[PDB]
Amino acid sequence: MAQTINLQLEGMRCAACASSIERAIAKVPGVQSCQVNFALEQAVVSYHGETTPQILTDAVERAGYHARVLKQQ
C-alpha cells in the first residue's frame, strides 16, 4: 500500500549510484514516490504493492550502498 520508508543510505559517496536507485525502484509495482538526498544521506520511498518485498533493500545493494534507520526519537 502507500507506506513510505524514510531512512539513511550508507556507504554513499560518488557517481550516478544515488538517483540510479530511484530510477531502478521506478519499476517496482508498489512505487508511489521516491526522493534521495545525496548530501544529507536520506532516502524516502513508498514502494510496496500487495506487500513489502526484500526488493526494498536489494535496490540499494545494487548501488554498492546499504540501508539503515535514521533515528533519535
Side-chain angles (χ1 to χ4, degrees):
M1 293 302 285
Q3 67 206 65
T4 187
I5 311 304
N6 61 103
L7 92 177
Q8 265 174 282
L9 199 153
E10 184 165 82
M12 88 80 180
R13 256 128 186 83
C14 212
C17 295
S19 196
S20 204
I21 296 166
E22 304 170 301
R23 205 77 188 284
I25 292 171
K27 287 64 171 297
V28 176
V31 73
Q32 65 98 151
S33 279
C34 306
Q35 279 110 89
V36 77
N37 186 328
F38 200 31
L40 156 66
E41 285 191 347
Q42 77 250 161
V44 57
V45 194
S46 167
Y47 55 153
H48 309 283
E50 66 310 302
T51 196
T52 281
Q54 184 171 349
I55 300 170
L56 88 86
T57 310
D58 186 81
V60 201
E61 304 291 300
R62 65 78 84 263
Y65 303 151
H66 267 216
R68 82 155 176 279
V69 287
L70 77 82
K71 212 201 183 307
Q72 8 63 355
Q73 201 183 0

PDB file of all heavy atoms in Angstrom, residues 16-48:
ATOM      1  N   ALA A  16      26.732   8.165 -10.362  1.00  0.00           N
ATOM      2  CA  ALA A  16      25.281   8.144 -10.572  1.00  0.00           C
ATOM      3  C   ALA A  16      24.524   7.227  -9.584  1.00  0.00           C
ATOM      4  O   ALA A  16      23.292   7.246  -9.553  1.00  0.00           O
ATOM      5  CB  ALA A  16      25.029   7.743 -12.033  1.00  0.00           C
ATOM      6  N   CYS A  17      25.240   6.432  -8.775  1.00  0.00           N
ATOM      7  CA  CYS A  17      24.740   5.432  -7.834  1.00  0.00           C
ATOM      8  C   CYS A  17      23.657   5.900  -6.846  1.00  0.00           C
ATOM      9  O   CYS A  17      22.993   5.039  -6.287  1.00  0.00           O
ATOM     10  CB  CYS A  17      25.958   4.868  -7.085  1.00  0.00           C
ATOM     11  SG  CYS A  17      27.043   3.978  -8.230  1.00  0.00           S
ATOM     12  N   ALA A  18      23.449   7.204  -6.628  1.00  0.00           N
ATOM     13  CA  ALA A  18      22.330   7.719  -5.832  1.00  0.00           C
ATOM     14  C   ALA A  18      20.999   7.611  -6.597  1.00  0.00           C
ATOM     15  O   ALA A  18      20.246   6.665  -6.403  1.00  0.00           O
ATOM     16  CB  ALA A  18      22.661   9.148  -5.385  1.00  0.00           C
ATOM     17  N   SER A  19      20.710   8.524  -7.525  1.00  0.00           N
ATOM     18  CA  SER A  19      19.408   8.540  -8.235  1.00  0.00           C
ATOM     19  C   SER A  19      19.178   7.312  -9.149  1.00  0.00           C
ATOM     20  O   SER A  19      18.049   6.952  -9.474  1.00  0.00           O
ATOM     21  CB  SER A  19      19.242   9.860  -9.003  1.00  0.00           C
ATOM     22  OG  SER A  19      17.898  10.067  -9.386  1.00  0.00           O
ATOM     23  N   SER A  20      20.229   6.566  -9.504  1.00  0.00           N
ATOM     24  CA  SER A  20      20.094   5.250 -10.156  1.00  0.00           C
ATOM     25  C   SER A  20      19.380   4.184  -9.281  1.00  0.00           C
ATOM     26  O   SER A  20      18.894   3.170  -9.795  1.00  0.00           O
ATOM     27  CB  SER A  20      21.482   4.788 -10.614  1.00  0.00           C
ATOM     28  OG  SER A  20      21.410   3.856 -11.679  1.00  0.00           O
ATOM     29  N   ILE A  21      19.272   4.416  -7.964  1.00  0.00           N
ATOM     30  CA  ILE A  21      18.357   3.707  -7.044  1.00  0.00           C
ATOM     31  C   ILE A  21      16.909   4.059  -7.402  1.00  0.00           C
ATOM     32  O   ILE A  21      16.170   3.188  -7.859  1.00  0.00           O
ATOM     33  CB  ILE A  21      18.703   4.047  -5.567  1.00  0.00           C
ATOM     34  CG1 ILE A  21      20.115   3.523  -5.213  1.00  0.00           C
ATOM     35  CG2 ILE A  21      17.639   3.512  -4.594  1.00  0.00           C
ATOM     36  CD1 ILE A  21      20.688   4.087  -3.912  1.00  0.00           C
ATOM     37  N   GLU A  22      16.536   5.336  -7.295  1.00  0.00           N
ATOM     38  CA  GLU A  22      15.178   5.836  -7.558  1.00  0.00           C
ATOM     39  C   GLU A  22      14.681   5.413  -8.948  1.00  0.00           C
ATOM     40  O   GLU A  22      13.571   4.892  -9.096  1.00  0.00           O
ATOM     41  CB  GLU A  22      15.163   7.370  -7.483  1.00  0.00           C
ATOM     42  CG  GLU A  22      15.674   7.952  -6.157  1.00  0.00           C
ATOM     43  CD  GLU A  22      15.848   9.462  -6.280  1.00  0.00           C
ATOM     44  OE1 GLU A  22      16.642   9.861  -7.162  1.00  0.00           O
ATOM     45  OE2 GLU A  22      15.217  10.193  -5.483  1.00  0.00           O
ATOM     46  N   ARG A  23      15.538   5.570  -9.965  1.00  0.00           N
ATOM     47  CA  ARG A  23      15.245   5.220 -11.354  1.00  0.00           C
ATOM     48  C   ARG A  23      15.150   3.706 -11.594  1.00  0.00           C
ATOM     49  O   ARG A  23      14.546   3.279 -12.582  1.00  0.00           O
ATOM     50  CB  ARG A  23      16.311   5.855 -12.266  1.00  0.00           C
ATOM     51  CG  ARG A  23      15.779   6.083 -13.687  1.00  0.00           C
ATOM     52  CD  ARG A  23      14.868   7.325 -13.723  1.00  0.00           C
ATOM     53  NE  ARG A  23      14.175   7.511 -15.014  1.00  0.00           N
ATOM     54  CZ  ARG A  23      14.692   7.965 -16.151  1.00  0.00           C
ATOM     55  NH1 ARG A  23      15.983   8.152 -16.322  1.00  0.00           N
ATOM     56  NH2 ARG A  23      13.901   8.252 -17.161  1.00  0.00           N
ATOM     57  N   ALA A  24      15.747   2.876 -10.733  1.00  0.00           N
ATOM     58  CA  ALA A  24      15.504   1.436 -10.751  1.00  0.00           C
ATOM     59  C   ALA A  24      14.211   1.080  -9.998  1.00  0.00           C
ATOM     60  O   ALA A  24      13.409   0.311 -10.520  1.00  0.00           O
ATOM     61  CB  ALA A  24      16.725   0.702 -10.181  1.00  0.00           C
ATOM     62  N   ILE A  25      13.969   1.685  -8.826  1.00  0.00           N
ATOM     63  CA  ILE A  25      12.776   1.449  -7.990  1.00  0.00           C
ATOM     64  C   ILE A  25      11.504   1.856  -8.729  1.00  0.00           C
ATOM     65  O   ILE A  25      10.471   1.219  -8.550  1.00  0.00           O
ATOM     66  CB  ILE A  25      12.895   2.174  -6.628  1.00  0.00           C
ATOM     67  CG1 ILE A  25      14.008   1.533  -5.770  1.00  0.00           C
ATOM     68  CG2 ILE A  25      11.551   2.108  -5.881  1.00  0.00           C
ATOM     69  CD1 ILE A  25      14.343   2.326  -4.500  1.00  0.00           C
ATOM     70  N   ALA A  26      11.604   2.823  -9.639  1.00  0.00           N
ATOM     71  CA  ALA A  26      10.541   3.208 -10.569  1.00  0.00           C
ATOM     72  C   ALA A  26       9.923   2.035 -11.370  1.00  0.00           C
ATOM     73  O   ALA A  26       8.888   2.216 -12.000  1.00  0.00           O
ATOM     74  CB  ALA A  26      11.094   4.309 -11.482  1.00  0.00           C
ATOM     75  N   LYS A  27      10.532   0.838 -11.374  1.00  0.00           N
ATOM     76  CA  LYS A  27       9.955  -0.385 -11.944  1.00  0.00           C
ATOM     77  C   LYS A  27       9.222  -1.279 -10.917  1.00  0.00           C
ATOM     78  O   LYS A  27       8.574  -2.239 -11.326  1.00  0.00           O
ATOM     79  CB  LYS A  27      11.089  -1.185 -12.608  1.00  0.00           C
ATOM     80  CG  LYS A  27      11.629  -0.601 -13.920  1.00  0.00           C
ATOM     81  CD  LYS A  27      12.325   0.769 -13.827  1.00  0.00           C
ATOM     82  CE  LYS A  27      13.016   1.164 -15.137  1.00  0.00           C
ATOM     83  NZ  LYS A  27      14.103   0.221 -15.499  1.00  0.00           N
ATOM     84  N   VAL A  28       9.335  -1.022  -9.613  1.00  0.00           N
ATOM     85  CA  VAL A  28       8.675  -1.796  -8.546  1.00  0.00           C
ATOM     86  C   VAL A  28       7.176  -1.487  -8.580  1.00  0.00           C
ATOM     87  O   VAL A  28       6.829  -0.307  -8.571  1.00  0.00           O
ATOM     88  CB  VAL A  28       9.276  -1.467  -7.153  1.00  0.00           C
ATOM     89  CG1 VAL A  28       8.552  -2.192  -6.006  1.00  0.00           C
ATOM     90  CG2 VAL A  28      10.760  -1.867  -7.098  1.00  0.00           C
ATOM     91  N   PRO A  29       6.276  -2.492  -8.599  1.00  0.00           N
ATOM     92  CA  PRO A  29       4.853  -2.255  -8.828  1.00  0.00           C
ATOM     93  C   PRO A  29       4.190  -1.429  -7.718  1.00  0.00           C
ATOM     94  O   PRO A  29       3.190  -0.766  -7.964  1.00  0.00           O
ATOM     95  CB  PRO A  29       4.213  -3.642  -8.970  1.00  0.00           C
ATOM     96  CG  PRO A  29       5.183  -4.569  -8.239  1.00  0.00           C
ATOM     97  CD  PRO A  29       6.538  -3.922  -8.517  1.00  0.00           C
ATOM     98  N   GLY A  30       4.765  -1.415  -6.509  1.00  0.00           N
ATOM     99  CA  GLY A  30       4.282  -0.614  -5.383  1.00  0.00           C
ATOM    100  C   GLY A  30       4.872   0.793  -5.265  1.00  0.00           C
ATOM    101  O   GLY A  30       4.582   1.461  -4.273  1.00  0.00           O
ATOM    102  N   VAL A  31       5.724   1.225  -6.204  1.00  0.00           N
ATOM    103  CA  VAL A  31       6.334   2.569  -6.209  1.00  0.00           C
ATOM    104  C   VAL A  31       5.226   3.619  -6.329  1.00  0.00           C
ATOM    105  O   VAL A  31       4.388   3.561  -7.227  1.00  0.00           O
ATOM    106  CB  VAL A  31       7.400   2.723  -7.322  1.00  0.00           C
ATOM    107  CG1 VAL A  31       6.853   2.831  -8.757  1.00  0.00           C
ATOM    108  CG2 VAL A  31       8.278   3.950  -7.033  1.00  0.00           C
ATOM    109  N   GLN A  32       5.202   4.564  -5.394  1.00  0.00           N
ATOM    110  CA  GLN A  32       4.266   5.698  -5.431  1.00  0.00           C
ATOM    111  C   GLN A  32       4.930   7.048  -5.139  1.00  0.00           C
ATOM    112  O   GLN A  32       4.290   8.077  -5.344  1.00  0.00           O
ATOM    113  CB  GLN A  32       3.042   5.416  -4.533  1.00  0.00           C
ATOM    114  CG  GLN A  32       3.361   5.294  -3.031  1.00  0.00           C
ATOM    115  CD  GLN A  32       3.125   6.541  -2.169  1.00  0.00           C
ATOM    116  OE1 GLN A  32       2.831   6.442  -0.991  1.00  0.00           O
ATOM    117  NE2 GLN A  32       3.271   7.745  -2.668  1.00  0.00           N
ATOM    118  N   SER A  33       6.182   7.086  -4.671  1.00  0.00           N
ATOM    119  CA  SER A  33       7.002   8.300  -4.543  1.00  0.00           C
ATOM    120  C   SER A  33       8.415   7.920  -4.113  1.00  0.00           C
ATOM    121  O   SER A  33       8.545   7.184  -3.141  1.00  0.00           O
ATOM    122  CB  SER A  33       6.436   9.278  -3.498  1.00  0.00           C
ATOM    123  OG  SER A  33       5.391  10.053  -4.045  1.00  0.00           O
ATOM    124  N   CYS A  34       9.439   8.447  -4.795  1.00  0.00           N
ATOM    125  CA  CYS A  34      10.859   8.299  -4.462  1.00  0.00           C
ATOM    126  C   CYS A  34      11.489   9.687  -4.287  1.00  0.00           C
ATOM    127  O   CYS A  34      11.201  10.562  -5.106  1.00  0.00           O
ATOM    128  CB  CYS A  34      11.590   7.603  -5.628  1.00  0.00           C
ATOM    129  SG  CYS A  34      10.830   6.028  -6.106  1.00  0.00           S
ATOM    130  N   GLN A  35      12.338   9.885  -3.280  1.00  0.00           N
ATOM    131  CA  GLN A  35      13.271  11.009  -3.149  1.00  0.00           C
ATOM    132  C   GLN A  35      14.510  10.569  -2.341  1.00  0.00           C
ATOM    133  O   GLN A  35      14.371   9.996  -1.261  1.00  0.00           O
ATOM    134  CB  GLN A  35      12.612  12.213  -2.439  1.00  0.00           C
ATOM    135  CG  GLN A  35      11.712  13.117  -3.301  1.00  0.00           C
ATOM    136  CD  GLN A  35      10.216  13.022  -2.975  1.00  0.00           C
ATOM    137  OE1 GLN A  35       9.680  13.724  -2.134  1.00  0.00           O
ATOM    138  NE2 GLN A  35       9.462  12.181  -3.644  1.00  0.00           N
ATOM    139  N   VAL A  36      15.713  10.889  -2.825  1.00  0.00           N
ATOM    140  CA  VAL A  36      17.020  10.719  -2.165  1.00  0.00           C
ATOM    141  C   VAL A  36      17.764  12.059  -2.066  1.00  0.00           C
ATOM    142  O   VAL A  36      17.707  12.885  -2.977  1.00  0.00           O
ATOM    143  CB  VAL A  36      17.887   9.662  -2.899  1.00  0.00           C
ATOM    144  CG1 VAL A  36      18.535  10.158  -4.207  1.00  0.00           C
ATOM    145  CG2 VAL A  36      19.022   9.134  -2.007  1.00  0.00           C
ATOM    146  N   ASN A  37      18.483  12.262  -0.960  1.00  0.00           N
ATOM    147  CA  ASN A  37      19.255  13.470  -0.681  1.00  0.00           C
ATOM    148  C   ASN A  37      20.753  13.146  -0.635  1.00  0.00           C
ATOM    149  O   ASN A  37      21.306  12.808   0.417  1.00  0.00           O
ATOM    150  CB  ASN A  37      18.738  14.083   0.626  1.00  0.00           C
ATOM    151  CG  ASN A  37      19.367  15.433   0.952  1.00  0.00           C
ATOM    152  OD1 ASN A  37      20.517  15.715   0.635  1.00  0.00           O
ATOM    153  ND2 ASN A  37      18.634  16.303   1.613  1.00  0.00           N
ATOM    154  N   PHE A  38      21.429  13.283  -1.783  1.00  0.00           N
ATOM    155  CA  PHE A  38      22.848  12.950  -1.972  1.00  0.00           C
ATOM    156  C   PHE A  38      23.812  14.013  -1.386  1.00  0.00           C
ATOM    157  O   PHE A  38      24.807  14.382  -2.003  1.00  0.00           O
ATOM    158  CB  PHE A  38      23.061  12.640  -3.467  1.00  0.00           C
ATOM    159  CG  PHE A  38      24.290  11.833  -3.866  1.00  0.00           C
ATOM    160  CD1 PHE A  38      24.850  10.855  -3.016  1.00  0.00           C
ATOM    161  CD2 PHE A  38      24.809  11.987  -5.168  1.00  0.00           C
ATOM    162  CE1 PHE A  38      25.909  10.047  -3.461  1.00  0.00           C
ATOM    163  CE2 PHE A  38      25.864  11.172  -5.617  1.00  0.00           C
ATOM    164  CZ  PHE A  38      26.412  10.202  -4.763  1.00  0.00           C
ATOM    165  N   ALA A  39      23.473  14.514  -0.193  1.00  0.00           N
ATOM    166  CA  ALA A  39      24.225  15.467   0.622  1.00  0.00           C
ATOM    167  C   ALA A  39      23.933  15.291   2.129  1.00  0.00           C
ATOM    168  O   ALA A  39      24.827  15.498   2.943  1.00  0.00           O
ATOM    169  CB  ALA A  39      23.887  16.886   0.147  1.00  0.00           C
ATOM    170  N   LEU A  40      22.722  14.854   2.518  1.00  0.00           N
ATOM    171  CA  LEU A  40      22.304  14.612   3.900  1.00  0.00           C
ATOM    172  C   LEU A  40      21.858  13.133   4.129  1.00  0.00           C
ATOM    173  O   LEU A  40      21.225  12.789   5.123  1.00  0.00           O
ATOM    174  CB  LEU A  40      21.300  15.760   4.183  1.00  0.00           C
ATOM    175  CG  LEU A  40      20.254  15.549   5.271  1.00  0.00           C
ATOM    176  CD1 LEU A  40      20.868  15.434   6.678  1.00  0.00           C
ATOM    177  CD2 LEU A  40      19.230  16.694   5.277  1.00  0.00           C
ATOM    178  N   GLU A  41      22.206  12.228   3.208  1.00  0.00           N
ATOM    179  CA  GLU A  41      22.178  10.756   3.341  1.00  0.00           C
ATOM    180  C   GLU A  41      20.784  10.109   3.383  1.00  0.00           C
ATOM    181  O   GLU A  41      20.711   8.881   3.391  1.00  0.00           O
ATOM    182  CB  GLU A  41      22.968  10.252   4.569  1.00  0.00           C
ATOM    183  CG  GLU A  41      24.489  10.295   4.421  1.00  0.00           C
ATOM    184  CD  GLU A  41      25.185   9.538   5.558  1.00  0.00           C
ATOM    185  OE1 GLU A  41      24.496   9.219   6.561  1.00  0.00           O
ATOM    186  OE2 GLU A  41      26.401   9.269   5.425  1.00  0.00           O
ATOM    187  N   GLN A  42      19.672  10.848   3.450  1.00  0.00           N
ATOM    188  CA  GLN A  42      18.368  10.172   3.473  1.00  0.00           C
ATOM    189  C   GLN A  42      17.935   9.652   2.104  1.00  0.00           C
ATOM    190  O   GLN A  42      18.196  10.274   1.075  1.00  0.00           O
ATOM    191  CB  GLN A  42      17.223  10.981   4.102  1.00  0.00           C
ATOM    192  CG  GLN A  42      16.603  12.123   3.241  1.00  0.00           C
ATOM    193  CD  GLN A  42      16.896  13.551   3.714  1.00  0.00           C
ATOM    194  OE1 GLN A  42      16.773  14.511   2.974  1.00  0.00           O
ATOM    195  NE2 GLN A  42      17.290  13.803   4.943  1.00  0.00           N
ATOM    196  N   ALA A  43      17.127   8.593   2.140  1.00  0.00           N
ATOM    197  CA  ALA A  43      16.064   8.374   1.158  1.00  0.00           C
ATOM    198  C   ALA A  43      14.685   8.369   1.836  1.00  0.00           C
ATOM    199  O   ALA A  43      14.566   8.035   3.016  1.00  0.00           O
ATOM    200  CB  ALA A  43      16.329   7.075   0.382  1.00  0.00           C
ATOM    201  N   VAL A  44      13.647   8.714   1.076  1.00  0.00           N
ATOM    202  CA  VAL A  44      12.247   8.424   1.391  1.00  0.00           C
ATOM    203  C   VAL A  44      11.579   7.765   0.186  1.00  0.00           C
ATOM    204  O   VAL A  44      11.631   8.306  -0.919  1.00  0.00           O
ATOM    205  CB  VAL A  44      11.470   9.666   1.890  1.00  0.00           C
ATOM    206  CG1 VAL A  44      11.477  10.865   0.930  1.00  0.00           C
ATOM    207  CG2 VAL A  44      10.021   9.327   2.269  1.00  0.00           C
ATOM    208  N   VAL A  45      10.976   6.587   0.387  1.00  0.00           N
ATOM    209  CA  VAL A  45      10.251   5.874  -0.678  1.00  0.00           C
ATOM    210  C   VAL A  45       9.086   5.059  -0.121  1.00  0.00           C
ATOM    211  O   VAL A  45       9.268   4.251   0.789  1.00  0.00           O
ATOM    212  CB  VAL A  45      11.138   4.920  -1.523  1.00  0.00           C
ATOM    213  CG1 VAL A  45      10.427   4.477  -2.802  1.00  0.00           C
ATOM    214  CG2 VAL A  45      12.516   5.479  -1.928  1.00  0.00           C
ATOM    215  N   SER A  46       7.910   5.183  -0.743  1.00  0.00           N
ATOM    216  CA  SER A  46       6.893   4.124  -0.686  1.00  0.00           C
ATOM    217  C   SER A  46       6.906   3.333  -1.992  1.00  0.00           C
ATOM    218  O   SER A  46       6.705   3.887  -3.073  1.00  0.00           O
ATOM    219  CB  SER A  46       5.492   4.657  -0.380  1.00  0.00           C
ATOM    220  OG  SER A  46       4.499   3.669  -0.625  1.00  0.00           O
ATOM    221  N   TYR A  47       7.112   2.026  -1.846  1.00  0.00           N
ATOM    222  CA  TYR A  47       7.485   1.080  -2.901  1.00  0.00           C
ATOM    223  C   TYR A  47       6.987  -0.350  -2.620  1.00  0.00           C
ATOM    224  O   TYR A  47       7.705  -1.331  -2.779  1.00  0.00           O
ATOM    225  CB  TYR A  47       8.980   1.192  -3.279  1.00  0.00           C
ATOM    226  CG  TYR A  47      10.104   1.066  -2.241  1.00  0.00           C
ATOM    227  CD1 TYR A  47      11.360   0.600  -2.684  1.00  0.00           C
ATOM    228  CD2 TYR A  47       9.999   1.532  -0.908  1.00  0.00           C
ATOM    229  CE1 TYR A  47      12.488   0.637  -1.842  1.00  0.00           C
ATOM    230  CE2 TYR A  47      11.108   1.516  -0.043  1.00  0.00           C
ATOM    231  CZ  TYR A  47      12.362   1.088  -0.513  1.00  0.00           C
ATOM    232  OH  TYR A  47      13.436   1.102   0.321  1.00  0.00           O
ATOM    233  N   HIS A  48       5.733  -0.461  -2.168  1.00  0.00           N
ATOM    234  CA  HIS A  48       5.142  -1.690  -1.618  1.00  0.00           C
ATOM    235  C   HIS A  48       3.709  -1.888  -2.148  1.00  0.00           C
ATOM    236  O   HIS A  48       2.854  -1.016  -1.968  1.00  0.00           O
ATOM    237  CB  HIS A  48       5.161  -1.579  -0.086  1.00  0.00           C
ATOM    238  CG  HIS A  48       6.509  -1.202   0.468  1.00  0.00           C
ATOM    239  ND1 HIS A  48       7.603  -2.055   0.611  1.00  0.00           N
ATOM    240  CD2 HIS A  48       6.884   0.058   0.828  1.00  0.00           C
ATOM    241  CE1 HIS A  48       8.617  -1.287   1.038  1.00  0.00           C
ATOM    242  NE2 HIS A  48       8.206  -0.016   1.199  1.00  0.00           N
TER     243      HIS A  48
END
